């Protein structure tokens, strides 16, 4: 799949344009569904997938919390497209052997679980607060067939192998289970545009 | 609109099935879009709308954070449907004159904003933890054209006029902006033994 990026939709669509902006040069592979987009990467028909993840006003985005780790994928980038509604996307590859070399400008997406008791999330976030680490996304998910715990996806500033994030995530681990890095990637300059 | 419930999708869809489960004997009103679904309730073509909100495995749901309050709607119920995957839905009406009467067995859905600074969410959740209040959903959203604050949706056990939630919500108002009760409704028996 070298230099192919899959997206959900048709040629010329906004998602196609997003691919062409985010990954110049690359050949885009239109797919009808989210599952097909992830399959193309899993199966080697494409190197990357472009997945819508947030909208500022309106939209339906795929829920990736289960499917993306099941497919063995990993987030290597983000993209913002302002159409105003702003659509944010994740860019995902097959899982790399190593994380990017640490330095400035990174963000991290992770998954973790906490139990369904008051203050459970709060205890897991305490290290981040004390370390002065800024989060930028947090979303809860039901567990199938259970209400005794909740899964979370979190986007957070920094790189997991560097301060200040590393020590803060050590504390999150103390008060959660099933901690998994779903991506490490450069934060878009869109976030700092005047 | 009396005894009519609108949903997004084609007839026969899982949302249609959810309507038949949740409101037996009601007439269902298929709508192509999310905007059309909420408009039907706003405009009086339907008394309720069935809106998908979460999936345990996978799915696409409408993002309600902006359009639902704009349409003057209020969440009066929840529903769960098992299809390997569980889909949860909100059931929304035109905003009532008064909240439901305080009593046992309620949950509350709210919106609020916090600043994009470390520990801002953590400070807002401290009161709920101190009060022994259990949350069951939390989801962040982007504000259009600003990265200085983040919008949240929260589902929490209790009724806003009854302890322990009442005092906790009062505290939350000193740690957030634009705090809004979006719904107060019975917790489904699906969370216990249905
Ligand atoms: N950035 C703020 C608010 C926030 C929390 C979590 C997700 C998104 C925003 C914080 O880290 O507390
Ligand atoms: N119920 C736990 C975990 C949780 C937090 C937020 C949303 C969903 C679950 C708490 O209140 O801390």
CSV table of C-alpha atoms and ligand atoms in Angstrom, one decimal:
chain,number,residue,atom,x,y,z
A,1,UNK,CA,0.0,0.0,0.0
A,2,UNK,CA,3.1,2.3,-0.2
A,3,UNK,CA,1.9,6.0,-0.6
A,4,UNK,CA,-1.8,5.1,-0.7
A,5,UNK,CA,-4.2,6.6,1.8
A,6,UNK,CA,-7.7,5.2,2.1
A,7,UNK,CA,-10.7,7.4,3.0
A,8,UNK,CA,-14.5,7.0,3.3
A,9,UNK,CA,-16.4,8.6,0.5
A,10,UNK,CA,-16.1,9.4,-3.2
A,11,UNK,CA,-13.4,11.1,-5.4
A,12,UNK,CA,-13.6,14.9,-5.1
A,13,UNK,CA,-15.3,14.8,-1.7
A,14,UNK,CA,-14.1,16.7,1.3
A,15,UNK,CA,-12.4,13.6,2.8
A,16,UNK,CA,-10.5,13.2,-0.5
A,17,UNK,CA,-9.4,16.9,-0.3
A,18,UNK,CA,-8.4,16.3,3.3
A,19,UNK,CA,-6.1,13.4,2.2
A,20,UNK,CA,-4.5,15.6,-0.5
A,21,UNK,CA,-3.8,18.4,2.0
A,22,UNK,CA,-2.6,16.2,4.8
A,23,UNK,CA,-0.4,13.8,2.7
A,24,UNK,CA,0.7,15.6,-0.5
A,25,UNK,CA,1.8,13.4,-3.3
A,26,UNK,CA,-0.2,10.4,-2.0
A,27,UNK,CA,-2.7,8.3,-4.1
A,28,UNK,CA,-6.1,8.3,-2.4
A,29,UNK,CA,-8.3,5.1,-2.3
A,30,UNK,CA,-12.0,5.8,-2.0
A,31,UNK,CA,-13.9,3.3,0.3
A,32,UNK,CA,-17.7,3.1,0.9
A,33,UNK,CA,-17.4,2.4,4.7
A,34,UNK,CA,-15.2,3.0,7.7
A,35,UNK,CA,-14.7,-0.8,8.1
A,36,UNK,CA,-13.4,-1.0,4.5
A,37,UNK,CA,-11.1,2.0,5.1
A,38,UNK,CA,-9.5,0.2,8.1
A,39,UNK,CA,-9.4,-3.1,6.3
A,40,UNK,CA,-7.4,-1.6,3.4
A,41,UNK,CA,-4.7,-0.6,5.9
A,42,UNK,CA,-4.9,-3.9,7.8
A,43,UNK,CA,-4.7,-5.9,4.6
A,44,UNK,CA,-1.9,-3.9,2.9
A,45,UNK,CA,-4.0,-2.3,0.1
A,46,UNK,CA,-3.2,1.1,1.7
A,47,UNK,CA,-0.5,2.5,4.0
A,48,UNK,CA,-2.7,5.1,5.8
A,49,UNK,CA,-6.4,5.6,6.6
A,50,UNK,CA,-8.1,9.0,7.0
A,51,UNK,CA,-10.8,8.7,9.7
A,52,UNK,CA,-13.1,11.6,10.7
A,53,UNK,CA,-13.1,12.0,14.6
A,54,UNK,CA,-14.7,15.3,15.7
A,55,UNK,CA,-16.9,18.0,14.3
A,56,UNK,CA,-17.3,21.5,15.8
A,57,UNK,CA,-21.0,21.9,14.7
A,58,UNK,CA,-22.4,18.8,13.2
A,59,UNK,CA,-21.5,15.4,11.9
A,60,UNK,CA,-21.5,11.6,12.4
A,61,UNK,CA,-18.1,10.1,12.9
A,62,UNK,CA,-17.1,6.4,13.3
A,63,UNK,CA,-16.5,5.1,16.7
A,64,UNK,CA,-13.0,3.7,16.7
A,65,UNK,CA,-12.4,2.8,20.3
A,66,UNK,CA,-12.8,-1.0,19.6
A,67,UNK,CA,-12.2,-1.4,15.9
A,68,UNK,CA,-9.0,0.5,15.6
A,69,UNK,CA,-6.9,-1.6,18.1
A,70,UNK,CA,-8.7,-4.8,16.9
A,71,UNK,CA,-7.4,-4.0,13.4
A,72,UNK,CA,-3.9,-3.4,14.8
A,73,UNK,CA,-3.8,0.2,13.7
A,74,UNK,CA,-2.1,3.2,15.3
A,75,UNK,CA,-2.6,7.0,14.9
A,76,UNK,CA,0.3,8.8,13.2
A,77,UNK,CA,-1.3,12.1,12.5
A,78,UNK,CA,-4.2,14.5,12.8
A,79,UNK,CA,-5.8,16.9,10.3
A,80,UNK,CA,-8.3,19.8,10.6
A,81,UNK,CA,-10.5,21.0,7.7
A,82,UNK,CA,-12.8,24.0,8.0
A,83,UNK,CA,-15.7,23.8,5.6
A,84,UNK,CA,-18.3,27.1,9.4
A,85,UNK,CA,-18.0,23.5,10.6
A,86,UNK,CA,-14.6,22.2,11.4
A,87,UNK,CA,-13.9,18.4,10.9
A,88,UNK,CA,-11.0,16.9,12.7
A,89,UNK,CA,-9.5,13.6,11.4
A,90,UNK,CA,-7.1,10.9,12.7
A,91,UNK,CA,-4.6,9.4,10.2
A,92,UNK,CA,-3.8,5.8,11.0
A,93,UNK,CA,-1.2,3.3,9.9
A,94,UNK,CA,-0.4,-0.3,10.7
A,95,UNK,CA,1.2,-0.3,14.2
A,96,UNK,CA,4.9,0.7,14.1
A,97,UNK,CA,7.6,-1.2,16.0
A,98,UNK,CA,8.7,2.0,17.9
A,99,UNK,CA,7.3,5.4,18.8
A,100,UNK,CA,8.5,8.6,17.0
A,101,UNK,CA,11.7,10.0,18.5
A,102,UNK,CA,10.8,12.3,21.4
A,103,UNK,CA,10.9,16.1,21.1
A,104,UNK,CA,8.5,19.0,21.2
A,105,UNK,CA,5.2,19.3,19.5
A,106,UNK,CA,3.8,15.9,20.1
A,107,UNK,CA,0.5,14.6,21.3
A,108,UNK,CA,-0.7,11.2,22.4
A,109,UNK,CA,-3.9,9.3,22.1
A,110,UNK,CA,-4.5,6.6,24.7
A,111,UNK,CA,-7.1,4.2,25.9
A,112,UNK,CA,-7.7,3.1,29.6
A,113,UNK,CA,-10.4,1.7,31.8
A,114,UNK,CA,-11.7,2.8,35.3
A,115,UNK,CA,-14.3,1.3,37.6
A,116,UNK,CA,-17.8,2.6,38.0
A,117,UNK,CA,-17.4,4.3,41.3
A,118,UNK,CA,-17.5,8.1,42.2
A,119,UNK,CA,-14.2,9.8,41.8
A,120,UNK,CA,-12.6,7.0,39.7
A,121,UNK,CA,-11.9,9.2,36.7
A,122,UNK,CA,-10.9,12.1,39.0
A,123,UNK,CA,-8.2,9.9,40.7
A,124,UNK,CA,-6.7,8.9,37.3
A,125,UNK,CA,-6.5,12.5,36.1
A,126,UNK,CA,-4.7,13.8,39.3
A,127,UNK,CA,-1.2,13.2,38.0
A,128,UNK,CA,-1.9,15.2,34.9
A,129,UNK,CA,-3.2,18.1,36.9
A,130,UNK,CA,-0.2,18.2,39.2
A,131,UNK,CA,2.2,18.0,36.3
A,132,UNK,CA,0.6,20.9,34.4
A,133,UNK,CA,-0.2,18.6,31.4
A,134,UNK,CA,-3.0,19.8,29.1
A,135,UNK,CA,-5.6,17.3,27.7
A,136,UNK,CA,-7.4,18.0,24.5
A,137,UNK,CA,-9.9,15.1,24.1
A,138,UNK,CA,-11.7,12.8,26.5
A,139,UNK,CA,-14.5,10.4,25.6
A,140,UNK,CA,-16.1,7.6,27.6
A,141,UNK,CA,-17.4,4.3,26.1
A,142,UNK,CA,-19.7,1.5,27.5
A,143,UNK,CA,-18.3,-1.9,27.9
A,144,UNK,CA,-20.3,-4.5,26.1
A,145,UNK,CA,-22.4,-6.5,28.6
A,146,UNK,CA,-21.1,-4.7,31.7
A,147,UNK,CA,-21.9,-1.5,33.7
A,148,UNK,CA,-19.1,-2.1,36.3
A,149,UNK,CA,-16.4,-0.1,34.4
A,150,UNK,CA,-16.0,2.4,31.7
A,151,UNK,CA,-13.4,2.7,28.9
A,152,UNK,CA,-11.9,6.1,27.9
A,153,UNK,CA,-10.1,7.5,24.9
A,154,UNK,CA,-7.9,10.5,25.7
A,155,UNK,CA,-5.8,12.9,23.6
A,156,UNK,CA,-3.1,14.7,25.6
A,157,UNK,CA,-0.3,17.0,24.9
A,158,UNK,CA,3.2,15.5,24.9
A,159,UNK,CA,5.1,12.3,24.2
A,160,UNK,CA,4.9,9.2,26.5
A,161,UNK,CA,8.6,8.7,26.7
A,162,UNK,CA,9.4,12.3,27.6
A,163,UNK,CA,8.6,14.7,30.5
A,164,UNK,CA,6.2,16.0,31.5
A,165,UNK,CA,3.8,13.4,30.1
A,166,UNK,CA,5.7,10.3,31.2
A,167,UNK,CA,5.4,10.7,35.0
A,168,UNK,CA,1.8,12.0,34.7
A,169,UNK,CA,0.8,8.8,32.9
A,170,UNK,CA,2.6,6.7,35.5
A,171,UNK,CA,0.1,8.1,38.0
A,172,UNK,CA,-2.9,7.5,35.6
A,173,UNK,CA,-1.8,3.9,35.5
A,174,UNK,CA,-1.9,3.6,39.2
A,175,UNK,CA,-5.6,4.4,39.2
A,176,UNK,CA,-6.7,2.7,35.9
A,177,UNK,CA,-6.5,-0.6,34.0
A,178,UNK,CA,-5.7,-1.7,30.5
A,179,UNK,CA,-3.6,1.3,29.4
A,180,UNK,CA,-2.8,1.3,25.7
A,181,UNK,CA,-1.1,3.9,23.5
A,182,UNK,CA,-3.3,4.3,20.4
A,183,UNK,CA,-1.1,7.0,18.8
A,184,UNK,CA,1.8,9.5,19.1
A,185,UNK,CA,1.9,12.2,16.5
A,186,UNK,CA,2.6,15.9,15.8
A,187,UNK,CA,-0.1,18.3,17.0
A,188,UNK,CA,-1.4,20.4,14.1
A,189,UNK,CA,-0.5,24.1,13.9
A,190,UNK,CA,-4.3,24.7,13.2
A,191,UNK,CA,-4.7,24.6,17.1
A,192,UNK,CA,-2.5,27.7,17.5
A,193,UNK,CA,-3.6,29.8,14.5
A,194,UNK,CA,-4.8,33.4,15.5
B,1,UNK,CA,-47.3,15.3,17.4
B,2,UNK,CA,-49.1,13.4,20.1
B,3,UNK,CA,-47.9,9.8,20.3
B,4,UNK,CA,-45.7,10.2,17.3
B,5,UNK,CA,-41.9,9.5,17.7
B,6,UNK,CA,-39.4,10.6,15.0
B,7,UNK,CA,-36.2,8.8,14.2
B,8,UNK,CA,-33.3,9.2,11.8
B,9,UNK,CA,-33.1,6.6,9.1
B,10,UNK,CA,-35.0,4.4,6.9
B,11,UNK,CA,-38.1,2.5,8.0
B,12,UNK,CA,-37.0,-0.9,9.3
B,13,UNK,CA,-33.7,0.5,10.6
B,14,UNK,CA,-32.4,-0.2,14.1
B,15,UNK,CA,-33.7,3.2,15.3
B,16,UNK,CA,-37.2,2.3,14.1
B,17,UNK,CA,-37.0,-0.9,16.0
B,18,UNK,CA,-35.8,1.1,19.1
B,19,UNK,CA,-38.9,3.3,18.8
B,20,UNK,CA,-41.2,0.2,18.8
B,21,UNK,CA,-39.4,-1.2,21.9
B,22,UNK,CA,-39.3,2.1,23.8
B,23,UNK,CA,-42.7,3.5,23.0
B,24,UNK,CA,-45.0,0.5,22.0
B,25,UNK,CA,-48.1,1.5,20.0
B,26,UNK,CA,-46.7,4.9,19.0
B,27,UNK,CA,-46.6,5.9,15.4
B,28,UNK,CA,-43.0,6.2,14.1
B,29,UNK,CA,-41.9,9.0,11.8
B,30,UNK,CA,-38.9,8.3,9.6
B,31,UNK,CA,-36.6,11.3,8.9
B,32,UNK,CA,-33.6,11.3,6.5
B,33,UNK,CA,-31.4,13.5,8.6
B,34,UNK,CA,-30.6,14.4,12.1
B,35,UNK,CA,-31.7,18.0,11.5
B,36,UNK,CA,-35.0,16.8,10.1
B,37,UNK,CA,-35.5,14.5,13.2
B,38,UNK,CA,-35.0,17.3,15.7
B,39,UNK,CA,-37.0,19.7,13.5
B,40,UNK,CA,-40.0,17.4,13.6
B,41,UNK,CA,-40.1,17.6,17.4
B,42,UNK,CA,-39.4,21.4,17.4
B,43,UNK,CA,-42.1,22.0,14.8
B,44,UNK,CA,-44.8,19.7,16.4
B,45,UNK,CA,-44.9,16.9,13.8
B,46,UNK,CA,-43.7,14.6,16.5
B,47,UNK,CA,-43.8,14.5,20.3
B,48,UNK,CA,-40.5,12.7,20.8
B,49,UNK,CA,-37.3,11.9,18.9
B,50,UNK,CA,-35.2,8.8,19.2
B,51,UNK,CA,-31.5,9.7,18.9
B,52,UNK,CA,-28.7,7.2,18.9
B,53,UNK,CA,-25.9,8.3,21.3
B,54,UNK,CA,-23.4,5.5,22.1
B,55,UNK,CA,-22.3,2.1,20.9
B,56,UNK,CA,-20.4,-0.6,22.9
B,57,UNK,CA,-18.6,-1.9,19.8
B,58,UNK,CA,-19.1,0.4,16.8
B,59,UNK,CA,-21.5,2.8,15.1
B,60,UNK,CA,-22.0,6.4,13.9
B,61,UNK,CA,-24.2,8.7,16.0
B,62,UNK,CA,-25.2,12.3,15.5
B,63,UNK,CA,-23.3,14.9,17.4
B,64,UNK,CA,-25.9,16.7,19.6
B,65,UNK,CA,-23.8,19.2,21.5
B,66,UNK,CA,-24.8,22.3,19.5
B,67,UNK,CA,-28.0,21.5,17.5
B,68,UNK,CA,-30.0,19.9,20.3
B,69,UNK,CA,-30.1,23.0,22.7
B,70,UNK,CA,-30.5,25.3,19.7
B,71,UNK,CA,-33.7,23.3,18.7
B,72,UNK,CA,-35.1,23.8,22.3
B,73,UNK,CA,-35.3,20.1,23.0
B,74,UNK,CA,-34.8,18.2,26.3
B,75,UNK,CA,-33.9,14.6,27.1
B,76,UNK,CA,-36.8,12.7,28.8
B,77,UNK,CA,-35.6,9.2,28.5
B,78,UNK,CA,-32.9,6.7,27.5
B,79,UNK,CA,-33.1,3.4,25.7
B,80,UNK,CA,-30.7,0.5,25.1
B,81,UNK,CA,-30.9,-2.0,22.3
B,82,UNK,CA,-28.8,-5.1,21.8
B,83,UNK,CA,-28.2,-6.0,18.2
B,84,UNK,CA,-22.6,-8.4,19.8
B,85,UNK,CA,-23.2,-4.5,20.0
B,86,UNK,CA,-25.3,-2.4,22.4
B,87,UNK,CA,-26.7,0.9,21.0
B,88,UNK,CA,-27.8,3.5,23.6
B,89,UNK,CA,-30.3,6.3,22.6
B,90,UNK,CA,-31.6,9.5,24.1
B,91,UNK,CA,-35.3,10.2,23.9
B,92,UNK,CA,-36.0,14.0,23.5
B,93,UNK,CA,-39.1,16.2,23.7
B,94,UNK,CA,-39.8,19.9,23.4
B,95,UNK,CA,-38.4,21.5,26.6
B,96,UNK,CA,-41.0,21.1,29.5
B,97,UNK,CA,-42.3,23.9,31.7
B,98,UNK,CA,-40.7,22.3,34.8
B,99,UNK,CA,-38.3,19.6,35.6
B,100,UNK,CA,-39.6,16.1,36.4
B,101,UNK,CA,-40.5,15.9,40.2
B,102,UNK,CA,-37.5,15.0,42.4
B,103,UNK,CA,-37.6,11.4,43.4
B,104,UNK,CA,-35.4,8.3,43.2
B,105,UNK,CA,-34.1,6.6,40.1
B,106,UNK,CA,-33.2,9.6,38.0
B,107,UNK,CA,-30.2,10.6,35.9
B,108,UNK,CA,-29.2,13.9,34.4
B,109,UNK,CA,-27.5,15.0,31.2
B,110,UNK,CA,-25.7,18.3,31.1
B,111,UNK,CA,-23.5,20.5,29.0
B,112,UNK,CA,-20.7,22.7,30.4
B,113,UNK,CA,-17.4,24.3,29.2
B,114,UNK,CA,-14.0,24.4,30.9
B,115,UNK,CA,-10.9,26.4,29.9
B,116,UNK,CA,-8.1,24.7,27.9
B,117,UNK,CA,-5.7,24.8,30.8
B,118,UNK,CA,-4.2,21.9,32.8
B,119,UNK,CA,-6.4,20.6,35.6
B,120,UNK,CA,-9.5,22.6,34.5
B,121,UNK,CA,-11.6,19.4,34.1
B,122,UNK,CA,-10.1,17.9,37.2
B,123,UNK,CA,-11.2,20.9,39.3
B,124,UNK,CA,-14.7,20.6,38.0
B,125,UNK,CA,-14.9,16.9,38.8
B,126,UNK,CA,-13.6,17.3,42.4
B,127,UNK,CA,-17.0,18.4,43.7
B,128,UNK,CA,-18.7,15.4,42.2
B,129,UNK,CA,-16.1,13.1,43.7
B,130,UNK,CA,-16.3,14.7,47.2
B,131,UNK,CA,-20.2,14.4,47.1
B,132,UNK,CA,-20.1,10.7,46.1
B,133,UNK,CA,-21.8,11.3,42.8
B,134,UNK,CA,-21.2,8.6,40.1
B,135,UNK,CA,-20.9,9.7,36.4
B,136,UNK,CA,-21.8,7.4,33.6
B,137,UNK,CA,-20.9,9.4,30.4
B,138,UNK,CA,-18.4,12.2,29.6
B,139,UNK,CA,-17.5,13.4,26.2
B,140,UNK,CA,-15.5,16.5,25.0
B,141,UNK,CA,-16.2,18.6,21.9
B,142,UNK,CA,-14.4,21.3,19.9
B,143,UNK,CA,-15.8,24.8,19.9
B,144,UNK,CA,-15.9,26.3,16.4
B,145,UNK,CA,-12.9,28.6,15.8
B,146,UNK,CA,-11.6,28.4,19.4
B,147,UNK,CA,-9.0,26.3,21.2
B,148,UNK,CA,-9.2,28.4,24.4
B,149,UNK,CA,-12.0,26.2,26.0
B,150,UNK,CA,-13.6,22.8,25.5
B,151,UNK,CA,-17.2,21.8,25.6
B,152,UNK,CA,-18.4,18.7,27.6
B,153,UNK,CA,-21.5,16.6,27.7
B,154,UNK,CA,-21.9,14.6,31.0
B,155,UNK,CA,-24.4,12.0,32.2
B,156,UNK,CA,-24.6,11.7,35.9
B,157,UNK,CA,-26.7,9.8,38.4
B,158,UNK,CA,-29.4,11.8,40.3
B,159,UNK,CA,-31.8,14.6,39.9
B,160,UNK,CA,-30.6,18.3,40.0
B,161,UNK,CA,-33.0,19.3,42.8
B,162,UNK,CA,-32.2,16.4,45.1
B,163,UNK,CA,-29.1,15.5,47.1
B,164,UNK,CA,-26.4,14.5,46.4
B,165,UNK,CA,-26.5,15.9,42.9
B,166,UNK,CA,-28.0,19.3,43.7
B,167,UNK,CA,-25.1,20.7,45.8
B,168,UNK,CA,-22.6,19.1,43.3
B,169,UNK,CA,-24.1,21.0,40.4
B,170,UNK,CA,-24.1,24.2,42.3
B,171,UNK,CA,-20.4,23.7,42.9
B,172,UNK,CA,-19.8,22.8,39.2
B,173,UNK,CA,-21.2,26.3,38.3
B,174,UNK,CA,-18.0,27.8,39.9
B,175,UNK,CA,-15.7,25.6,37.8
B,176,UNK,CA,-17.4,25.9,34.4
B,177,UNK,CA,-19.1,28.2,32.0
B,178,UNK,CA,-22.4,27.7,30.1
B,179,UNK,CA,-23.6,24.9,32.4
B,180,UNK,CA,-27.0,23.6,31.0
B,181,UNK,CA,-29.3,20.8,32.1
B,182,UNK,CA,-30.1,19.0,28.8
B,183,UNK,CA,-32.3,16.3,30.4
B,184,UNK,CA,-33.5,14.6,33.5
B,185,UNK,CA,-34.9,11.1,33.1
B,186,UNK,CA,-35.3,7.7,34.7
B,187,UNK,CA,-32.2,5.4,34.5
B,188,UNK,CA,-33.2,2.4,32.4
B,189,UNK,CA,-33.7,-1.0,33.9
B,190,UNK,CA,-31.2,-2.2,31.2
B,191,UNK,CA,-28.4,-0.9,33.7
B,192,UNK,CA,-29.8,-3.3,36.3
B,193,UNK,CA,-31.8,-6.4,35.4
B,194,UNK,CA,-34.1,-5.6,32.4
C,1,LIG,N1,-7.6,21.1,28.7
C,1,LIG,C1,-8.4,21.0,30.0
C,1,LIG,C2,-9.8,20.6,29.7
C,1,LIG,C3,-10.0,19.3,29.0
C,1,LIG,C4,-9.9,18.1,29.7
C,1,LIG,C5,-10.0,16.9,29.0
C,1,LIG,C6,-10.2,16.9,27.6
C,1,LIG,C7,-10.3,18.1,26.9
C,1,LIG,C8,-10.2,19.3,27.6
C,1,LIG,C9,-7.7,20.0,31.0
C,1,LIG,O1,-6.7,19.3,30.7
C,1,LIG,O2,-8.2,19.9,32.1
C,2,LIG,N1,-18.2,6.4,37.1
C,2,LIG,C1,-16.8,6.8,37.3
C,2,LIG,C2,-16.1,6.7,36.0
C,2,LIG,C3,-16.7,7.6,34.9
C,2,LIG,C4,-16.5,8.9,34.8
C,2,LIG,C5,-17.0,9.7,33.8
C,2,LIG,C6,-17.9,9.1,32.9
C,2,LIG,C7,-18.1,7.8,32.9
C,2,LIG,C8,-17.5,7.0,33.9
C,2,LIG,C9,-16.7,8.2,37.9
C,2,LIG,O1,-17.8,8.9,38.1
C,2,LIG,O2,-15.6,8.7,38.1
